[PDB]
Amino acid sequence: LRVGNRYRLGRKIGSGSFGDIYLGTDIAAGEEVAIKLECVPQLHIESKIYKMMQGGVGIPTIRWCGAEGDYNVMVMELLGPSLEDLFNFCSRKFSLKTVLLLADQMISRIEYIHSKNFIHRDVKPDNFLMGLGKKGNLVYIIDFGLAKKYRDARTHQHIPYRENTGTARYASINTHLGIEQSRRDDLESLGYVLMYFNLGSLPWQGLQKYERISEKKMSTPIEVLCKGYPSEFATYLNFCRSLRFDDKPDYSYLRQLFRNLFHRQGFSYDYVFDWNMLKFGASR
């Protein structure tokens, strides 16, 4: 069984936003790949977005795009485990060093996507994957199925402020209020992801239910949310919430917050994340 006469098809391994994902092998390489399938529609648009993103650091490479049988098909390099997977392996606790190391790269990925005229609109641990081999310390961003253009390609004219979607847990407050998303919202979602990494859980977890999530988010002060953690996180979230709809975020400032924190703590920029330090042994 071959997709596009080159990629042998395998077991189902996941889902994206709206298609199924299967393991595969480029037998002509020989490389392991991920293959997204879609019943004959959104895959082709996402694939155009992926192609626009090619070349950037931490953007997965598209090996092949096309259609076969009853399916639209996209073939991508298969990467490593998501940040959520790794979070679970590390007992749902990341050290501060690991969080800051992740923050640096994640802010960079979001900035690149913005530099290419798009907003991701679904920033969450499952859409960040680690690389393989010599790129094992590289954070990749995936899934452009909900992505949307925020400014005109030629003029750079920002879209107009408007009314009216991804995962509720990490959604920006503007999103809960039915506001059209922009750059600030990707960055805010990132803030929630980082605090999630610090805490093990967010205070609006385990409470229609989107209304309860929205009101819990709105009723939770940032200084309560970030109690017991370096002030940099509260500063980050406040900055993101303070951005105007069409403002260009100061990505460098946000990265420098976390970097200066990183150095004042004495951590070294090697790439030892917590998951490079797990102990193994016999069945316990």
Curated annotation (Swiss-Prot):
Catalytic residues, chain numbering: 122 (proton acceptor)
Secretion signal span: none
Effect of inactivating the gene: Lethal. There are fewer embryos than expected at late stages of gestation; they weigh about 30% less than control animals, but appear otherwise normal. Mice die shortly after birth. Tissue-specific disruption increases the half-life of PER2 protein and alters circadian protein expression dynamics.
UniProt superkingdom: Eukaryota
Post-translational modification as stated in the protein's UniProt record: Autophosphorylated on serine and threonine residues; this autophosphorylation represses activity. Reactivated by phosphatase-mediated dephosphorylation. May be dephosphorylated by PP1.
Span within the parent record: 3 to 299 of 415
Intrachain S-S bonds: none
Protein name (record): Casein kinase I isoform delta
Gene name for this UniProt entry: Csnk1d
Organism: Mus musculus
